[PDB]
Structures are given as C-alpha cells and as structure tokens.
C-alpha cells in the first residue's frame, strides 16, 4: 500500500491547494493600494558597537529596549548598553562556533548555541558577581540555528537535525519534540502569546507548531530556496520569511496562504534576517549584499536602505518600543539606526 | 565607574584577539581522519589542540555533522589550511569510494569560501594500497590507465587526479603526502606546509606578489 496511499497524499494536497485558492478573494496589493505610501525613510547610524573581533552571527534585544546581546565566532557573547554604548558583560564560550543567541524576557538569562549541538544557558543575576553557566541542553544531533526563551524556565530551539525541541531548563530535557521537516531548520519565531511558533527550514517550507500539543497546525510553502529568516507580525496573525532566492514573503495564518512578496530585480542575494517595526508597517530585511532594505510591508515597496556595513548583515532586531533598529554583520560591528 | 568597566572589558577582549591570531586554524575533512587526528593528538564538532615547534594548531573535525554543509561551511572561512584525508587502499571498494573522495575534494577545493586557502592532502594507507595494487588492477577505479600494477606509478596517477581537480592555480597550493598509519612524519609535514602558507601570506599582504 504505497502507490495508492501516495496518490491519496497528492489528492489531499490538491484539495488543500484548491481550498487556499477558493478563499483567496483579492490580493493584498489591490485593497492596500488605497493606503498612503510610507514615503521615504532615512535612518541615521546613532551608535556603533565595536568590541567583536570576528563575524557576528546573532543579536537579540532585551525587553528593556536598552540591553542587547551579540554573538561572534571570536568566542564571545557581549551584552551592550545601547544608550551609553557601554559593555555590561563579556561572556566567554566553550565552543567558538555559535549561530544563535537569545535574551530571557525577564532579563536574567542569556542562551546561545551552534556547531556543538548544545544550547547553553547563562545566569546574568548571580550573587557572586559573574555570569555563570546554569544549564547545557544536549538533545540535538545537528547544529543549533535558533533558540528563544518562553520564560525563565522553558526554551524552544531549532536544529540542523530537522527538528525543533521545547526544553525544561530546570531538568534539562526536551518536554516535546517537533518533527516533520525534511531539511535543516534555520530559524524560529515565537508568537506574542508564546503558545505558537513558526519555523523555516532548508526544504523551503515554514510550519506552524503548537507548543503545548507538539503538532503541525499549518504548513507554508512558496519559497524556491532555503528559508534563512522568519519573524512574527506584531499581532501574531501573520509572519514573514527570508529565503536564499532573494525574496521575503508574508504568510497569513488564517487565510493559510502567502499575502505578498518583497523582491526586487536588482536584488539577487539571499536574505539573512528579517524583522518588523512596532506597528508592523516596516519589514526590515538583512541581505547578503552588505546592506539592509526597509520594506513597506503593506505596499511591498522598498522605503529605505541601511547601507553602513562592510560585509553582509547577519542579524537584525527592533526594540519592543520601536525606538531603534540594530544590525550585526560579518564586519564585526553592530550599528543602531533611528 | 560603568564606563570604566566597559574599558576594562575592551582591554581583555582585545588581548584575547591577539592570542587567537597567533594560532593556526586547520579544518580537517575527508578515509583515515582518525589516524591523522590520533597521530597529532599531542594534547557536533570535535576540536583538537596541539603544539609543534612553538606553533599552536587547532584542528576542527566536522565528520559528525550530518547536516547541509552549505549552511555552516562559511563558518570556517579564515582557516590557515584544510587537511583533506584520502585512503589510497580504497579504490576497489564501494558509488566507488575513490570517486566519492574526488567528488568531495572538488567541492571544497573549488569552494568560493576557500579561494585562498591551501589544501594539505593526505593519501593514507599506502601499505594496504601497495598490496592490493599487485593483487587487483587499478582499472576498476580509473578505466583509463597504463601502469597497470605498480605502487609508484599507480600512486602517482592517483595523486595527479587530485591536484588536477584544482581549478584555482597560483591562488593556492596543494601539499600532497603519502602516509601509512605507522608514519611518524605527519606533524612535521603539516608544520612544514603551514610555514609555507604563512610566508606566502606575508608576501601577499605586502602586495609583493
């Protein structure tokens, strides 16, 4: 029972595609054409954080909107004061190859991981006056590409072993394992309510997961190459992905289909990171051509360009108040834009 | 006070970069890698640190990475050299083993992240190759060949099909070495070939070449 069972799979896939097209009344660009364009956005480099001596791979804002972590493969995990450009902490890492880092929404912990297949958790609020290693989560067989705290107790990680995992940091074991992808999972994005999350993988597909259950609720396709970046819309009813085919796409969770594409003919490089502004009107994408493009998220127009890095921009984040944007790069510099 | 803490951190961050710039970073690919690792084992990803004649080497073995190399290969851009390990005694084995090494060697050698990175080729298991070459012909692996059964000619033919896979010429070197497990020269050869890489890097930085 393989050929007929597989034919049933195609028949159900065809039925799914018919359902998505059936509900697609009008494209987003037809109804949003009545909106006034954002116009032009010129963001100046307000701060330049220079303490890293290698390529910067990941950065994360603290919920304070003032503190942020960065990870470089010089073996360092630095916490910055973005107002005074001061260095709060400098955490040395056991393994230099880090591909991700996270900040606990409470501000007491920092997480990072990479080519060692381990998500280490660091305590930022020790009584002895130093940042310690509080936990080393070791359950993946492939490199760790993203990780984000749900609280001070449980964290979700993606990996190159094609699976995502939810962890209990107090015990150090996977509470649930999320399976179903075919290629490496490159990114994940927590929903604002922190009961759902999306993950994009190297099979050019994004899947929506339920944290408590452990099952795929929906699957999203359309990208022609690996999905390197993914971010949730501020209201949590949509998310945007950045792929290697030089396109970003906005996917709706209710309509179960893509809304619009953010691509330009002169852009022939892969997207390394994506982000949204506080109002979800600006999609900020980092590109491999050494600069970040600001996109009008409702009209699919490039509203601005953050051209200030000598190498490709690896990471991209917006503060929880929308005041600033941070961009890291392989040129070893983080820059804050406003 | 807080500003003075940031400056103290800068001092130690910049002192760490100086220490990390005096070390030779080697990427180990391949086969016989475990032989090479165990040969210079003086002291997801397995990192081996050893010291030879005042140089500190860091080998990074990525054998236990079952993922898409395209995603993490760029992390090793900037290594001094790549040690590629091939087993001579595996050409009649199984598609063909010797053509799997050739397919992988062409991938890394012509990789865009490794345009200037020299390759140290280790053709391992020469004792088992010289016994099987007299027992079985090399035509099983290379249908086009003349010196049917002889270690010297067969090995030279193999070594020539690995250095002819190099498309970038005058951009980097390939330092080929024949090595049995009993060999006790491997570390010296890596040190000798690394010293050549360093010197060529100094002259290229000054624009002299």
């Amino acid at each position, epitope marked *: 029972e393989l050929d007929q069972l597989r034919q049933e799979a195609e028949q159900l896939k065809n039925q799914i595609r018919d359902a998505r097209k059936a509900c697609a009344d009008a494209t987003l660009s037809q109804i949003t054409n009545n909106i006034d364009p954002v116009g032009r956005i010129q963001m100046r480099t307000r701060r330049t954080l220079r303490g890293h001596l290698a390529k910067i791979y990941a950065m994360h804002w603290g919920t304070d909107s003032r503190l942020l972590v960065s990870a470089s493969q010089d073996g360092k995990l630095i916490i910055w004061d973005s107002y005074t450009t001061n260095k709060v902490h400098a955490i040395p890492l056991r393994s230099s190859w880090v591909m991700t880092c996270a900040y606990a929404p409470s501000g007491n912990y920092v997480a990072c991981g990479g080519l060692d297949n381990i998500c280490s958790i660091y305590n930022l609020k020790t009584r002895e006056g130093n940042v310690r290693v509080s936990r080393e989560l070791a359950g993946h067989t492939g490199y760790l590409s993203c990780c984000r705290f749900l609280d001070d107790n449980q964290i979700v990680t993606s990996s190159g072993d094609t699976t995502c995992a939810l962890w209990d940091i107090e015990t150090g074991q996977q509470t649930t394992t999320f399976t179903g992808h075919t290629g490496d999972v490159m990114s994940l994005s927590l929903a604002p309510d922190t009961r759902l999350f999306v993950s994009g993988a190297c099979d050019a597909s994004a899947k929506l997961w339920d944290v408590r259950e452990g099952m795929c609720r929906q699957t999203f396709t359309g990208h022609e190459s690996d999905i390197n970046a993914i971010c949730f819309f501020p209201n949590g009813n949509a998310f945007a992905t950045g792929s290697d085919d030089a396109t970003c796409r906005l996917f709706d969770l209710r309509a179960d289909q893509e809304l619009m594409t953010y691509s330009h003919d002169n852009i022939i490089c892969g997207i390394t990171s994506v982000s949204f502004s506080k109002s979800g009107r600006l999609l900020l994408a980092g590109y491999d051509d050494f600069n970040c493009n600001v996109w009008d998220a409702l009209k699919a127009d490039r509203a601005g360009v953050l051209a200030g890095h000598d190498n490709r921009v690896s990471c991209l984040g917006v503060t929880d108040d929308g005041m600033a944007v941070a961009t890291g790069s392989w040129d070893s510099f983080l820059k804050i834009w406003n | *006070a807080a500003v003075e803490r940031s400056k103290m951190i800068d001092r130690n961050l910049r002192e760490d970069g100086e220490k990390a710039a005096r070390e030779v970073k080697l990427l180990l690919l391949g086969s016989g890698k475990n032989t090479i690792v165990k040969q210079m084992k003086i002291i997801g990803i397995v990192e081996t640190h050893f010291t030879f004649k005042d140089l500190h080497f860091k080998m990074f073995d990525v054998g236990a990475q079952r993922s898409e190399r395209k995603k993490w290969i760029h992390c090793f851009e900037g290594v001094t050299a790549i040690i590629f390990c091939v087993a001579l005694s595996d050409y009649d084995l199984v598609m063909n083993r010797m053509h799997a090494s050739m397919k992988l060697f062409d991938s890394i050698c012509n990789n865009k992240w490794f345009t200037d990175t020299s390759i140290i080729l280790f053709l391992n298991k020469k004792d088992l190759f010289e016994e099987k070459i007299k027992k079985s012909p090399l035509t099983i692996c290379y249908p086009e060949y003349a010196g049917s059964n002889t270690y010297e000619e067969a090995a030279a033919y193999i070594q020539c099909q690995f250095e002819d896979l190099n498309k970038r010429k005058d951009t980097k070197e390939i330092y080929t070495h024949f090595t049995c497990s009993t060999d006790t020269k491997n570390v010296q050869f890596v040190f000798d070939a690394v010293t050549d890489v360093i010197i060529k890097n100094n002259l290229k930085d000054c624009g002299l070449f």
Partner: single-chain antibody
Amino acid sequence: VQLVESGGGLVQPGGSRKLSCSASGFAFSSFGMHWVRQAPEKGLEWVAYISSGSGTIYYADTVKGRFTISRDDPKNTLFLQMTSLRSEDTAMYYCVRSIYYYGSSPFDFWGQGTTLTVSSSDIVMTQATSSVPVTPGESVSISCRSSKSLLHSNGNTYLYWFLQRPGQSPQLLIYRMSNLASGVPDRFSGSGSGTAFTLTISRLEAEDVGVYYCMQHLEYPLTFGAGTKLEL
C-alpha cells in the same frame, strides 16, 4: 559571599594602622570597594573608594592625605593604611563591595566591620527625625532631604536606603530611590521627587527596627543622612 575585616583596636594618637578586608565567595576583582565608618552612636560616614582594577581612588577630605586605599586582587584583600590617627578617627570601619554596570546594585553587601579606637560643595543630607515610636502591623514612613537634586539627566535618582539592625552591620534596602535590593521583603518601598525622599514600610514586623540611613551616590564624597531610628 563574605567580607571579613581585621586590623582594628586601640591605638595612641599620632600612630598608624592598617585595616584589611578579605573577600570570600565572589568575584572580588570585578568589584569596587569602599571603606565606610560609623563613629560610636553618631552615624554613617563614607571614608574612601577604590575602583575595580585599581584605576580610580577617592577619599573624603576629612581623611585625605593620611589614608590610602590599596587592593590585592590575586589574594582577594582590600587594605586601609591609616596614619596620624586623631581622636575623631575612632569608629567602626566597614568594608563595602560595589559593582557598577547598568542595572547593578552597588552597595549590596557590607562586611562585619572592625572597631578602631584612638585614645585622648558637598551635598548635605538631613533626616527629619531621630526616633519614631510604632507598634508592629502599622505602616511607617521615613523621610530625608538633600541640598542638591539627586535626579540626574539620565533619569536616575541616586538615593540609597540602608538598615542597621541593633548589633549588626548595615544592609541595603533601596538603591536609586525606587529599586528593592536582593533578599529583602517586598513590603519596603522608596519614593521621592529629587530633593524630598521617603521610605514607606507596610505591615511593619518586629525585626524591621533599627536606624535607617539615606545615602546619595550622585557625586563624591558620598554623604549619609543623620539616621532615623524606629522605636518599639
């Protein structure tokens, strides 16, 4: 965490003494250390300061030129070499650890103190009263004043509240006027306007009795309040 000092005792005028403060159980090299003294039944008085790494050193003019703050990071020891000891130098000197980064609590732990006895511009901080009788379960309010405003352009108000229970060393309660220290019950609270500050204690308990101190960290020399005592 443990700061234990030694080197105190009785000395004749004109002599010199060296106090020590050995640290145990924390990253001593990453902390700026202060010397704070408290004359018999008078109040708190900051003496000096040495930065982490020995970069900065500060003194109070009352003792500047005769004392010196030295540090030995490998041994985790802090010294106070004192010379020309007058009668006014009689006091209990305390070793206090301080760390300054964004969000830190820079007066969190105090040593046990060591008694020194000698035989026979600045911001003024005033505490309105010196004794306040109350019974357990009643909300109390303490207040103190400053000459300058402690509110900076940062938005930080550098006012600190301490509590020295009978027979013990001071313990931090509030740092920067609104932030509760670590390990203190959440019934304490601090508020102010920039020059007028207050400390409100809800559901007062038996062990909340002692002299409350209000300190400014806006500028050097660091100055303490007179000291408000809660009576029961």
